[PDB]
Amino acid sequence: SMEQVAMELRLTELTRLLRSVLDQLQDKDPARIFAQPVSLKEVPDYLDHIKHPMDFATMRKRLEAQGYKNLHEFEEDFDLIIDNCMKYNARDTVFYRAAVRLRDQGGVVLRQARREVDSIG
Numbered sequence: 001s002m003e004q005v006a007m008e009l010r011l012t013e014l015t016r017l018l019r020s021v022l023d024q025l026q027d028k029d030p031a032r033i034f035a036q037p038v039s040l041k042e043v044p045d046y047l048d049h050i051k052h053p054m055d056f057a058t059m060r061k062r063l064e065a066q067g068y069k070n071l072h073e074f075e076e077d078f079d080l081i082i083d084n085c086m087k088y089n090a091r092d093t094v095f096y097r098a099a100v101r102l103r104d105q106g107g108v109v110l111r112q113a114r115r116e117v118d119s120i121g
C-alpha cells in the first residue's frame, strides 16, 4: 500500500536522524570506553551484575536494522550504557567518570533531537 511506503519513509528518515544523533553521542566518548560490549572473557561475572548490557556497537546494529521505532526506544538504550556503567563501577573510577561526562554532554544532543523529531513529525 502507499501508506506502508510512507511509513517506511518516515522510519528511514528517523533512522537517518538517529544515526546522526548516535554519531554525536559517540564523539563524546573519545576514550571509546562504551564502543564495544563489556568482554565476558575479561569480566566473567558481568552478567551477574548487569542484566541488560548495552554499548554503542550493539546500538548501531539495531539502528541499521531500523529497530528503533521512536526516539524513546533509542534513549532507553543510551541510558542503559550510562546506568550500567555507574552501577558496576565505583565513583572513583575512570569508567564511572566517563559515563557521567557522556551523560552530561549527551543531554544537549538529545534535547535538540527531541525537538527535531517532534518538529519533523
Ligand SMILES: CC(=O)N1CCNC(=O)C1
Pocket: 033, 034, 038, 039, 043, 084, 085, 088, 089, 095
Ligand atoms: C563499560 C564498562 O563498565 N567496563 C568496560 C571495560 N571493563 C570494565 O570492567 C568496565
